[PDB]
mmCIF file of C-alpha atoms and ligand atoms in Angstrom:
data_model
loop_
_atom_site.group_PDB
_atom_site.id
_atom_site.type_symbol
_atom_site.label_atom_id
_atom_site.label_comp_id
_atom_site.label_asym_id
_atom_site.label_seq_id
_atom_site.Cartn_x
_atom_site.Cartn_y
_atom_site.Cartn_z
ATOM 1 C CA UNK A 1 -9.957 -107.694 -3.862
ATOM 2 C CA UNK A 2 -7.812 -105.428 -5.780
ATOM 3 C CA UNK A 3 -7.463 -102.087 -4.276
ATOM 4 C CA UNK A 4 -8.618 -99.282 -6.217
ATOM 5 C CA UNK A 5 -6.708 -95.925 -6.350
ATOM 6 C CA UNK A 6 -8.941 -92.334 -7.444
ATOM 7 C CA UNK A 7 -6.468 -90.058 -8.967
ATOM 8 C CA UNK A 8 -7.089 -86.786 -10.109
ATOM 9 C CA UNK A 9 -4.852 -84.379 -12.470
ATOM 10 C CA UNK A 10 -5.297 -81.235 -11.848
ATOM 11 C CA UNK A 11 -2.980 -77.838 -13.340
ATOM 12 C CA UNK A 12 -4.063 -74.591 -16.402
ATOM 13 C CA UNK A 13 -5.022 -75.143 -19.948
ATOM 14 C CA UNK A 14 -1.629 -76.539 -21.531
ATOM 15 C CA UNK A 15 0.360 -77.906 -19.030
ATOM 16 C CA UNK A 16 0.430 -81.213 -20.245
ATOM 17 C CA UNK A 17 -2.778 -82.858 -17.861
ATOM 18 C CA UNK A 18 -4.053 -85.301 -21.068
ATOM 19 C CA UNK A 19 -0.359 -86.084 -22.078
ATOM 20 C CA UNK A 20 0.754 -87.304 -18.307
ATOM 21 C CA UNK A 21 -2.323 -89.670 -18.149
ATOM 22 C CA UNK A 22 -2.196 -91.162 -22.075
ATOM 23 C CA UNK A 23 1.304 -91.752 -21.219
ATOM 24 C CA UNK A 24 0.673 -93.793 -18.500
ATOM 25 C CA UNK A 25 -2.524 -95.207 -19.812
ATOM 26 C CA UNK A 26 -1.579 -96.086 -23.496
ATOM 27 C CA UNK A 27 1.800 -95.317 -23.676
ATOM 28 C CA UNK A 28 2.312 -93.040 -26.123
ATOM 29 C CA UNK A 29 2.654 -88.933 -26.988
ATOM 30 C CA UNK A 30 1.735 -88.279 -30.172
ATOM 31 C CA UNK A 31 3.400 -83.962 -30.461
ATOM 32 C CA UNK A 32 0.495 -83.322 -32.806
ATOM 33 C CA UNK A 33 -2.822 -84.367 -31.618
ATOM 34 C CA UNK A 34 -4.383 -84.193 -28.062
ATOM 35 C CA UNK A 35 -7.155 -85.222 -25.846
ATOM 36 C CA UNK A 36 -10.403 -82.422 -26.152
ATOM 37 C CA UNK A 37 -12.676 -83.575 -23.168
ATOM 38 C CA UNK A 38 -12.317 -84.684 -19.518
ATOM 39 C CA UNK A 39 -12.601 -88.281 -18.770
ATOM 40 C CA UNK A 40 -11.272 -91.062 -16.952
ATOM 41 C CA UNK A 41 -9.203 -94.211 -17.109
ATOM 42 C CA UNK A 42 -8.678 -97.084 -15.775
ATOM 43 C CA UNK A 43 -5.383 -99.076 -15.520
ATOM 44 C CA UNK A 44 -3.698 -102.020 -13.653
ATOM 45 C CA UNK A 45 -0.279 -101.181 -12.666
ATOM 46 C CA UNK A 46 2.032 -102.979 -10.206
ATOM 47 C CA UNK A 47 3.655 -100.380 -7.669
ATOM 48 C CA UNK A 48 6.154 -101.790 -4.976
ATOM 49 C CA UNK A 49 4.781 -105.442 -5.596
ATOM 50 C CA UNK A 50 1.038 -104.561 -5.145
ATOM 51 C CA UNK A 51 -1.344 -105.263 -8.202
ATOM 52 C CA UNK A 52 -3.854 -102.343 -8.119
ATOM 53 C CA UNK A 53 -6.490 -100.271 -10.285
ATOM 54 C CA UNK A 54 -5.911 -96.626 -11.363
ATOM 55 C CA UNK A 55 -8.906 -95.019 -11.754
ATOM 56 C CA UNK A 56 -7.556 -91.468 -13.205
ATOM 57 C CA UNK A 57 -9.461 -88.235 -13.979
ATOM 58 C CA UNK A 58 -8.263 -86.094 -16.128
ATOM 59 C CA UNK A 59 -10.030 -82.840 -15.950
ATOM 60 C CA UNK A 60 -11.172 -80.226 -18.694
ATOM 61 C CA UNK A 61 -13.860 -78.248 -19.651
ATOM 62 C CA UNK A 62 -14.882 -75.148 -17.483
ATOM 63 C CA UNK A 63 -13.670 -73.733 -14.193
ATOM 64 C CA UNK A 64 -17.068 -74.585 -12.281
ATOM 65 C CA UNK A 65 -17.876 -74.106 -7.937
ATOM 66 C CA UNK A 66 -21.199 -75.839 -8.241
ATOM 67 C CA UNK A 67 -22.180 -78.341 -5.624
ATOM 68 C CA UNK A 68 -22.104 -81.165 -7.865
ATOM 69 C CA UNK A 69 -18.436 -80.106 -9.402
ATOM 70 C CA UNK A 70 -17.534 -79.845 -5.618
ATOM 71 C CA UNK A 71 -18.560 -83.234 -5.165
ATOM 72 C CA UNK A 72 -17.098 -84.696 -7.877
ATOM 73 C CA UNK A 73 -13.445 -83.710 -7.282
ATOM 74 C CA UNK A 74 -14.299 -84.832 -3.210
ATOM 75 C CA UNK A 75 -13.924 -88.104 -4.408
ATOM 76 C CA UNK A 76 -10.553 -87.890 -5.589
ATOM 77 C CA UNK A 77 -8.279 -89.978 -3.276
ATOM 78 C CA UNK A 78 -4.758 -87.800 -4.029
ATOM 79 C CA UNK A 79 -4.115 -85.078 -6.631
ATOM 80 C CA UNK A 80 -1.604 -84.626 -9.507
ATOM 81 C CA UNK A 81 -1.121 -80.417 -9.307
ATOM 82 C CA UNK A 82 0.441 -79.602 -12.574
ATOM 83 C CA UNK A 83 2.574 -76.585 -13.981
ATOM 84 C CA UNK A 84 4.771 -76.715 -16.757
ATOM 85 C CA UNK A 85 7.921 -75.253 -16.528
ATOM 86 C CA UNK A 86 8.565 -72.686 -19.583
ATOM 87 C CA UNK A 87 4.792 -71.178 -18.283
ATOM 88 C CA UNK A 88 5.210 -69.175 -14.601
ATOM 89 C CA UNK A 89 1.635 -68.388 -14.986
ATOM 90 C CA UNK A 90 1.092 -72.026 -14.654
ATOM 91 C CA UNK A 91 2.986 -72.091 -11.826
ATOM 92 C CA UNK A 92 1.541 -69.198 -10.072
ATOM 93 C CA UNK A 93 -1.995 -70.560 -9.988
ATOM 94 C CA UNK A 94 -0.801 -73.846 -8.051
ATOM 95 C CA UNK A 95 -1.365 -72.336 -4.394
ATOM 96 C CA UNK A 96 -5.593 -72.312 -5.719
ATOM 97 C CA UNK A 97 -5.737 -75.771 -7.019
ATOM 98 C CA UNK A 98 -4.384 -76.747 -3.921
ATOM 99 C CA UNK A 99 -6.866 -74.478 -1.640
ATOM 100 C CA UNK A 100 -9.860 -75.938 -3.650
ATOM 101 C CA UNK A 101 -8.745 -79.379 -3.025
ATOM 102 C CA UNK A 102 -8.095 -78.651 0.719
ATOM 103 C CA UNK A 103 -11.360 -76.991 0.520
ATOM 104 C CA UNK A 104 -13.561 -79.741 -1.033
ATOM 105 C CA UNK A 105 -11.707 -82.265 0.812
ATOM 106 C CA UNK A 106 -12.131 -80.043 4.394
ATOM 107 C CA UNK A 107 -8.883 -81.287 5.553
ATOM 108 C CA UNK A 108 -5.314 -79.891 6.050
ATOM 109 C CA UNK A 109 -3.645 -83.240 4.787
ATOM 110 C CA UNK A 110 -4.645 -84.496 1.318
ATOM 111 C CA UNK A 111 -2.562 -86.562 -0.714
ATOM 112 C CA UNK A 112 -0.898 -84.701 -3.608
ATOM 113 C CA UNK A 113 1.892 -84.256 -5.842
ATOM 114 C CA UNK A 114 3.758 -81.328 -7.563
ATOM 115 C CA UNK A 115 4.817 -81.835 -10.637
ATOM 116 C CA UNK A 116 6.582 -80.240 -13.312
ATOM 117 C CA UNK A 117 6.121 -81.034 -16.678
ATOM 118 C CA UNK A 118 8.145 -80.732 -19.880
ATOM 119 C CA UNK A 119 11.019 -81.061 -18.408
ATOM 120 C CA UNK A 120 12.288 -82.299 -22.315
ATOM 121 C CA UNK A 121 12.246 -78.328 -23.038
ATOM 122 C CA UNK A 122 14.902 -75.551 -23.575
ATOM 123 C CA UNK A 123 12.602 -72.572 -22.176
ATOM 124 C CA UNK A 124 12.651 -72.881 -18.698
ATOM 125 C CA UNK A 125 11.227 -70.363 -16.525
ATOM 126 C CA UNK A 126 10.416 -71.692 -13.353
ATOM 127 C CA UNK A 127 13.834 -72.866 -11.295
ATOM 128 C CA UNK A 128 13.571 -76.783 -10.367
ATOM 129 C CA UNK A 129 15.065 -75.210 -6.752
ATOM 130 C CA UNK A 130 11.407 -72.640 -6.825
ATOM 131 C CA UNK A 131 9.298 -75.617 -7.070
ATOM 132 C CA UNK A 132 11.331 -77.607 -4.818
ATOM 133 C CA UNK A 133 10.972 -75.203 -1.669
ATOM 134 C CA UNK A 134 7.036 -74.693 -3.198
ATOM 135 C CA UNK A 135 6.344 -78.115 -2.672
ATOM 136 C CA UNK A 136 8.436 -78.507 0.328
ATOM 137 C CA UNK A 137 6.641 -75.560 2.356
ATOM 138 C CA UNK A 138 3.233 -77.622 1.570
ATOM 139 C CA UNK A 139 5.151 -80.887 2.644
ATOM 140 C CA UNK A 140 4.144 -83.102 -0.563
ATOM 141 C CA UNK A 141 6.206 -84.543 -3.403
ATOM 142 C CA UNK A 142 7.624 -82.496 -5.801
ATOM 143 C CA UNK A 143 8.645 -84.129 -9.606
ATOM 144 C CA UNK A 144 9.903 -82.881 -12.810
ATOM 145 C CA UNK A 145 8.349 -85.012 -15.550
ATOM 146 C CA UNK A 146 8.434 -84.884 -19.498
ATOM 147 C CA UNK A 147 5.129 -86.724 -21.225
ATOM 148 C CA UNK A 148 6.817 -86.381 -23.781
ATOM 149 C CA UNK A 149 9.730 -88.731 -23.458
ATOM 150 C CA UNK A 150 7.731 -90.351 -20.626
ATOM 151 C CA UNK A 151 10.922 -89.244 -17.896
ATOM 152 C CA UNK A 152 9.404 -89.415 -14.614
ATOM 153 C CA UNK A 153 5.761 -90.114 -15.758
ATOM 154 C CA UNK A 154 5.722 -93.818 -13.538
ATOM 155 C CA UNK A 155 7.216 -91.687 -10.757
ATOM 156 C CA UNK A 156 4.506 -88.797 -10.647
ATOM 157 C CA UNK A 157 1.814 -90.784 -10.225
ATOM 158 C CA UNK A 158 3.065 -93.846 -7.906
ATOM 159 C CA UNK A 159 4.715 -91.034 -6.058
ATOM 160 C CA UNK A 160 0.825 -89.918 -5.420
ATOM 161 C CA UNK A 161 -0.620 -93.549 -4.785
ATOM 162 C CA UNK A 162 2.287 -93.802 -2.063
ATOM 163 C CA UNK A 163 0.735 -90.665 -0.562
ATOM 164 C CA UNK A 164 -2.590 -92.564 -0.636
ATOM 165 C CA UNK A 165 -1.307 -95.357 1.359
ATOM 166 C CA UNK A 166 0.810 -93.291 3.888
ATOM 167 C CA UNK A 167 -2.649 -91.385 4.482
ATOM 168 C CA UNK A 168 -4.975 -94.620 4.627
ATOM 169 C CA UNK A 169 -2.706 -95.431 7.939
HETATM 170 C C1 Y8N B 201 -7.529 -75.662 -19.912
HETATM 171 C C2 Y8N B 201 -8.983 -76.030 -19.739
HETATM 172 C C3 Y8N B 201 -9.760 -74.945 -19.088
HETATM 173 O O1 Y8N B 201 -10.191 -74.019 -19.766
HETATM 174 N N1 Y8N B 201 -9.994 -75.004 -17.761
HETATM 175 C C4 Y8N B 201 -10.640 -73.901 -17.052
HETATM 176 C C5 Y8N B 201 -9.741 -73.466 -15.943
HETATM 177 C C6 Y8N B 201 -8.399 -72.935 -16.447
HETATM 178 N N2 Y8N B 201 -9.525 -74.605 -15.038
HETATM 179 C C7 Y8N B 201 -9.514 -74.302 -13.705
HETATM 180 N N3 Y8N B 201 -9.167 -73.047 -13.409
HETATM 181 C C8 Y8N B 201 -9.050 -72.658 -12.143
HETATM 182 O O2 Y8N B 201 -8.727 -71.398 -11.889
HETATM 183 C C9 Y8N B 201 -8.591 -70.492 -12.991
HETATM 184 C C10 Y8N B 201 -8.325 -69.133 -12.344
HETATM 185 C C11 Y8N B 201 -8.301 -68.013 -13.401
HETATM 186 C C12 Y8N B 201 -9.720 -67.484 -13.419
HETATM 187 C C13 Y8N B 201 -10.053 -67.446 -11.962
HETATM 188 N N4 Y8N B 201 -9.457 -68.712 -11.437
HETATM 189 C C14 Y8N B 201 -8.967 -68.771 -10.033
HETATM 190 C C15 Y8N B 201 -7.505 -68.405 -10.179
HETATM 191 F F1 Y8N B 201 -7.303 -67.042 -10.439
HETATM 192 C C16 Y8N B 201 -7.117 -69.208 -11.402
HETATM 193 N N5 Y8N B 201 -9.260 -73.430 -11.092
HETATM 194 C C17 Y8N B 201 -9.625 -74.719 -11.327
HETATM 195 C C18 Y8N B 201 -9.838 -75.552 -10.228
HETATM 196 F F2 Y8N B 201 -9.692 -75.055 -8.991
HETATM 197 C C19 Y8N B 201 -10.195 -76.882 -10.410
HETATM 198 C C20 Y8N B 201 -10.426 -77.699 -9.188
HETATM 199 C C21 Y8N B 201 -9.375 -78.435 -8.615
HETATM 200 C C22 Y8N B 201 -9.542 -79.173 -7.448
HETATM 201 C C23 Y8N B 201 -10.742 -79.121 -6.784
HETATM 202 F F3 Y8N B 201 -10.937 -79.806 -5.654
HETATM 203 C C24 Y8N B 201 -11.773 -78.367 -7.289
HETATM 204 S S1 Y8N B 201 -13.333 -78.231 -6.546
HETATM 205 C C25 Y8N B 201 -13.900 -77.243 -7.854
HETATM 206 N N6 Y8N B 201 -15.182 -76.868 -7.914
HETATM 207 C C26 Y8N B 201 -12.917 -77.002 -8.774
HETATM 208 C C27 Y8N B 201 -13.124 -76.247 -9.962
HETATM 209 N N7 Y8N B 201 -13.374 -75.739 -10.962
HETATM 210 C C28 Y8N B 201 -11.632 -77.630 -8.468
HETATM 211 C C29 Y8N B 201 -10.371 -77.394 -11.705
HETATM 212 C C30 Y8N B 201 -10.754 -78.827 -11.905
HETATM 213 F F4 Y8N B 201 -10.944 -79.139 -13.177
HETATM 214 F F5 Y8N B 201 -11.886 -79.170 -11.285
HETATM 215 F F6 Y8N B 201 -9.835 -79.645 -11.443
HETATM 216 C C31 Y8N B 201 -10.151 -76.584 -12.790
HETATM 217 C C32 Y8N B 201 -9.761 -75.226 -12.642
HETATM 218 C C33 Y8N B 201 -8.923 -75.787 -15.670
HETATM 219 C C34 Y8N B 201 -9.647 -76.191 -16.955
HETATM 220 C C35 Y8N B 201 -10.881 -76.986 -16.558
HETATM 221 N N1 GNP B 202 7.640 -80.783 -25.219
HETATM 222 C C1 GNP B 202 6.601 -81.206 -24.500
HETATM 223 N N2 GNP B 202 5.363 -80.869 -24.867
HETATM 224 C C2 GNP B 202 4.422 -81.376 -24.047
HETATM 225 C C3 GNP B 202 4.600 -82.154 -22.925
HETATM 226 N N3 GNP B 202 3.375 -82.465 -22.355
HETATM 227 C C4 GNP B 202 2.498 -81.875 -23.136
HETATM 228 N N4 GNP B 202 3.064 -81.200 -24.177
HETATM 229 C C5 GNP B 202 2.380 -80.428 -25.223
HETATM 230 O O1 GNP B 202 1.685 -79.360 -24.603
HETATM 231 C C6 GNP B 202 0.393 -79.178 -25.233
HETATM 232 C C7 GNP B 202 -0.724 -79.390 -24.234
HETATM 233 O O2 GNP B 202 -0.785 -80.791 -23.874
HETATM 234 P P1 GNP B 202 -2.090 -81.425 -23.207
HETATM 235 O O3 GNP B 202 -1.725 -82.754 -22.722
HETATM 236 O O4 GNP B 202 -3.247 -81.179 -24.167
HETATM 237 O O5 GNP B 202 -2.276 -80.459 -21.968
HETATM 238 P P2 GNP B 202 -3.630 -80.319 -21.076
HETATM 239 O O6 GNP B 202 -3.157 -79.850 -19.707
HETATM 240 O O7 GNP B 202 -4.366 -81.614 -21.039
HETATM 241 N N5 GNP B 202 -4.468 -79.176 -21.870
HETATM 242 P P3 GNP B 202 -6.102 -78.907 -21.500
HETATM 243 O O8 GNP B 202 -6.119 -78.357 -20.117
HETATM 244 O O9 GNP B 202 -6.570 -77.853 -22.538
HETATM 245 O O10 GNP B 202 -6.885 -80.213 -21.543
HETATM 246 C C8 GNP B 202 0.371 -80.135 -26.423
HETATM 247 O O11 GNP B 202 0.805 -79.479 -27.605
HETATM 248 C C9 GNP B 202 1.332 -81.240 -25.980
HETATM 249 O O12 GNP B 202 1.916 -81.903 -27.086
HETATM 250 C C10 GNP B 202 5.947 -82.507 -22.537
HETATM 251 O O13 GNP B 202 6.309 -83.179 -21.567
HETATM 252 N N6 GNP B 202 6.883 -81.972 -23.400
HETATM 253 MG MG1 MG B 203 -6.400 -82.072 -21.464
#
């Protein structure tokens, strides 16, 4: 019936990973208190008319190349690669999330999105035009979101699930 879509957020400690996915999942940002642990959720959303299941890890805990971590993010459908933009460091790293997903899922062409997150903030230190040509020389999606004020949340991740599709065809 109801297609399911695997979606995994990826990005450093801080970024905003947790407040992305409660955003979309409950609806709310709460600037005090934040997920502690790596999980998953499930949600029914409607994107361009189809009714469909998120399924959406959000990861935590340690950086880990086991077989059985390797496995685990293998079954991730598309990827959410997150940075925040007042933290360059962030930014720097995403060229290895993306190699470990290429990696794990052995293939040149896996669905993914750049995004950008807290966009709602004054201390910007990576360019919007930086990320732009980043994501642009890896040919994916590139979008600034705040979880904060929930700008551009929907758009990050059906952005990703109409990466899915395009790649299912
Ligand atoms: C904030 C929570 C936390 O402490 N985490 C630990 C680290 C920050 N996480 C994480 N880190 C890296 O790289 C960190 C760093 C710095 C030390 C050396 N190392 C390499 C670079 F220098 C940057 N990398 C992570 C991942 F690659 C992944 C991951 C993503 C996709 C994927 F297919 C696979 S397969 C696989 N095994 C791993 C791993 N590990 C990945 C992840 C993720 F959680 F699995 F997604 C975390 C990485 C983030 C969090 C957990
Ligand atoms: N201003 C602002 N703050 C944000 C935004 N998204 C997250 N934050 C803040 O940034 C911090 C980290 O958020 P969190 O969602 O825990 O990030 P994470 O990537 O899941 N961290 P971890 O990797 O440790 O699980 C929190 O203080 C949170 O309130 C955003 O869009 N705007
Ligand atoms: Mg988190």
């Amino acid at each position: 019936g109801m297609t399911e879509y695997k979606l995994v957020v990826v990005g450093a400690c801080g970024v905003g990973k947790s407040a992305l996915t409660i955003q979309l999942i409950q609806n709310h940002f709460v600037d005090e208190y934040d997920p502690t642990i790596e999980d998953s959720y499930r949600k029914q959303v409607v994107i361009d008319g189809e009714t469909c299941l998120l399924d959406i890890l959000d990861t935590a805990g340690q950086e880990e190349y086991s077989a059985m971590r390797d496995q685990y993010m293998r079954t991730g459908e598309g990827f959410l690669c997150v940075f925040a933009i007042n933290n360059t460091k962030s930014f720097e790293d995403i060229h290895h999330y993306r190699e470990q997903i290429k990696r794990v899922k052995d293939s040149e062409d896996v669905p993914m999105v750049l995004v950008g997150n807290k966009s709602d903030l004054p201390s910007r230190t990576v360019d919007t035009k930086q990320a732009q040509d980043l994501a642009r020389s890896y040919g994916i999606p590139f979008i600034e979101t705040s979880a904060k004020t929930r700008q551009g949340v929907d758009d990050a991740f059906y952005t990703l699930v109409r990466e899915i599709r395009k790649h299912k065809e």
